[PDB]
Design a protein around this ligand. Structure first.
Ligand code: L2P
Ligand code: RET
Ligand code: LFA
Ligand code: LFA
Ligand code: LFA
Ligand code: LFA
Ligand code: LFA
Ligand code: LFA
Ligand code: LFA
Ligand code: LFA
Ligand code: LFA
Ligand code: LFA
Ligand code: LFA
Ligand code: LFA
Ligand code: BOG
Length: 219
């Protein structure tokens, strides 16, 4: 229990550091720019709360012979569409296309959560639904959204592509962790699972936010 608790506290601290840095960076509150900072504060702030809750030993749900971390999935349901929103803003995406990518994202996270909570082998059908919706989300990120980003200045398009790449490459690792970890075949221990996810969560949220902060200043 000590290892898992320690990892969750590390996640909480890293998320808190991001949250404070984004809130501070955003204080200037430029009318067009404010939205981006508030969104980053929401992304890392919600994650911080989730990690604190888990560190305190809340929401460790036993499912068959594994443990499900409910706050992790609730976190993702809330924070991943905020990341997609940030990317859609950057890309200058149209309202229909925003709706589509937010829908596909929500399918991924709901299917992953539901799958984690189903004891039997039918849970892999839920994983599959999420994997299919994720391929759709990736298509949008690398296709239509990238085309949309090209209507922006070269610097904004470069930022879009940088954050798009970070997002696509790291998000693609999560389903493999689900499959190899406790929700799937339970090869990886809960500690190894949590350690990998803490890194990935930190980089996809904080380590995404700092890249945007850097580009925003350099712009
Ligand atoms: C906008 C809405 C339409 C979307 C709402 C999200 C919704 C879709 C989530 C669906 C799942 C929902 C049905 C939950 C059911 C889970 C339940 C079956 C699990 C069993 O319950 C286990 C409990 C305690 O043991 O864990 C319980 C887990 C914890 C109690 C919850 C974990 C906390 C969250 C991860 C953090 C939430 C964010 C903060 C409330 C806001 C922080 C703001 C920030 C800026 C400081
Ligand atoms: C595709 C796929 C998944 C993707 C999860 C992802 C992409 C999580 C990203 C989390 C972030 C960025 C937190 C911040 C699941 C739900 C593991 C299982 C269903 C298949
Ligand atoms: C990571 C710093 C935030 C810690 C907040 C702790 C609040 C928990 C309230 C006590 C209940 C146990
Ligand atoms: C960024 C400032 C917030 C303080 C960090 C909170 C981490 C506290 C870890 C406490 C673990 C001991 C169990 C209680
Ligand atoms: C300006 C730099 C600020 C960076 C934001 C993150 C703050 C550091 C918080 C500690 C992070 C813990 C490291 C966990 C890594 C993933 C699990 C590794 C276990 C081997
Ligand atoms: C950040 C809010 C943390 C509250 C978690 C609830 C603590 C209950 C511990 C049992
Ligand atoms: C600052 C917002 C804190 C939200 C607390 C949610 C914790 C619920 C777990 C009981
Ligand atoms: C021991 C603490 C567990 C309490 C059950 C979860 C409370 C949910 C709070 C919802 C926050 C919005
Ligand atoms: C998924 C989060 C969306 C944030 C709301 C922003 C929409 C404002 C447009 C009016
Ligand atoms: C035991 C439940 C029945 C089998 C579930 C099917 C699992 C499918 C997961 C594969 C991922 C699909 C992605 C489409 C490939 C193109
Ligand atoms: C998108 C590229 C795949 C993500 C990497 C995560 C999976 C790497 C582990 C593959 C080897 C598994 C060996 C099974 C144990 C026998
Ligand atoms: C482009 C592909 C990248 C290579 C990654 C390899 C694929 C990862 C395999 C994940 C699912 C395989 C399930 C078999 C795991 C072994 C079962 C052990 C039981 C505890
Ligand atoms: C354990 C690793 C923690 C990852 C958090 C991400 C902080 C990295 C800072 C990125 C700065 C890029 C500036 C351009
Ligand atoms: C973290 C802030 C990033 C803001 C990107 C600026 C694009 C808005 C154009 C005005
Ligand atoms: C959920 C899985 C979805 C699979 C990804 C295929 C979606 C892309 O499919 C494409 O959509 C375009 C809209 O931008 C259309 O113009 C194209 O005709 C169509 O091929």
């Amino acid at each position: 229990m000590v290892g898992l608790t320690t990892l969750f506290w590390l996640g909480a601290i890293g998320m808190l550091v991001g949250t404070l840095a984004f809130a501070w960076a955003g204080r200037d509150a430029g009318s067009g720019e404010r939205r981006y900072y508030v969104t980053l504060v929401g992304i890392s702030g919600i994650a911080a709360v989730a990690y604190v809750v888990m560190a305190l030993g809340v929401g460790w749900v036993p499912v068959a012979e594994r443990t499900v971390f409910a706050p992790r999935y609730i976190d993702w349901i809330l924070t991943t569409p905020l990341i997609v929103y940030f990317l859609g803003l950057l890309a200058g995406l149209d309202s229909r296309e925003f709706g589509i990518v937010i829908t596909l994202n929500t399918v991924v996270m709901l299917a992953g959560f539901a799958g984690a909570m189903v004891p039997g082998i039918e849970r892999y059908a839920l994983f599959g639904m999420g994997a299919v919706a994720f391929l759709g989300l990736v298509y949008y990120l690398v296709g239509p959204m990238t085309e949309s980003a090209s209507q922006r200045s070269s610097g904004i398009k470069s930022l879009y592509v940088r954050l798009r790449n970070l997002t696509v490459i790291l998000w693609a690792i999560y389903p493999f962790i689900w499959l190899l970890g406790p929700p799937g075949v339970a090869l990886l221990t809960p500690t190894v699972d949590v350690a990998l996810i803490v890194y990935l969560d930190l980089v996809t949220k904080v380590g995404f936010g700092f890249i945007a902060l850097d580009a925003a200043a350099t712009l």
